[PDB]
Each structure stands twice: as C-alpha cells, then as structure tokens.
Amino acid sequence: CPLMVKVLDAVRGSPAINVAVHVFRKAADDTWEPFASGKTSESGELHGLTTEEEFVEGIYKVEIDTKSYWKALGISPFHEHAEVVFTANDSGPRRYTIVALLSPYSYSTTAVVTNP
Template sequence: MESSPLTTHVLNTGDGVPASRMAVSLHRLDSQTMIWSMLSVGTTNKDGRCSGLISREAFCCGTYKLHFETGSYWETLGQTCFYPYVEVVFSITDPQQRFHLPLLMSRFSFSTYRGS
C-alpha cells in the first residue's frame, strides 16, 4: 500500500521502549447512523509503529478513532494496567494532509497529540 495518510507510533514511556506487538484498529463514524465501522486492523512492529492503516483513496472527511489494545499489551509483559484499552477519537477536515497520532503510555497513564 502507498504510504498511509494516517500513521501511529506507540511508546511504552514507563519502560522507555517502543510498544511492539500491540493490536490497533481504525474505525470511522457514520454521521447518519452514528455507528462506528471498523476500517482496518494491525499490529505495531518492533519500533512501535503500525503502517498501512488506510489508503489515500479511502481517507475522507469525517470522525475516526484509533483503538489500542493496551491491556493485552501489558498482559504479554506479565503486568497489569489501569486502562484495558485506549481510544483516540479525532476529526479529519482535510484528508489531503498527513496525520500522525502517537500514543505515549505507561501502565497508569497515556497521552497523545497530533504530529506531522
């Protein structure tokens, strides 16, 4: 797939390492029915990145969410966490731009921002 207009990068800031092997899914909200539709699923690589979430052709204006399976990730490390998953909801008004949404997390906190 051509370079995705939407990328993410997950960092385990508690341990100072990329969060590899984390399940990630991308969803779009139907503005008529207000129901989320899953568009794609993926897994972060050894650098904590998940590529190929959506093609430029499929990317349009609307409300999206990235769903990160944080609980399962921590469980594979033999640890527990406070947040079983994290969802980041965002609006796209110009699909011609590139969007990078990193997730910085520890077992008891998370933050995100719009990067480039």
C-alpha cells in the same frame, strides 16, 4: 501514508511492539464501523492502515489495545484501551501520525499533522 500510529512504552523505554490497533469510521447512524487494523512493528510503528483515496473526510476512532500489551508484560494496567477520536481532513487531506505514550496508569495521545 495518511495515517501512522507510533506507540512508546514508558516503563521499559522502548517501542511498544505487537500492540493491536483498530481503526473505525463513524457511520451515518452514529455507530462505529470498524474498517483498518494492524499491530505495531519492532519500531512501535503501524503504517499502511489506509490510503489516500479511501481516507475521506469523516470522524475516525483509533483504538489501541493497551490492556493486552501490559498483560503480555505481566504488568497490571488501568485502562481497557486508549482511544483517539478525531475528525480527519476537514481542511483538505493531511498526513496524521498519532503518538501514544503508554504507562500502566497513564497515557498521552498526540497528533502530528502534516500537509502532504
């Protein structure tokens, strides 16, 4: 599982469930070509976005739809979304877990990168 997203809710103290996540790869012309999406599970996790073979070196964008999450809880948010943009696999294939810690006016994104 080369790419995993985990989302936590710092207001409720819970996994952030049903958060939509879209993944893009930067194209030759510098445009973003959306290619894996999903929604987080009851544990706040989204597994299964891509496979080893398809997840070649490149620049990737993970867009986490935080604004829809906070709207569905009735809480005003600041950001339109939380993006994470990174170059993948530059030194070989890696497994990436992106941990997003969400508050309405703040978030953090951390990568845990492990070698298979």
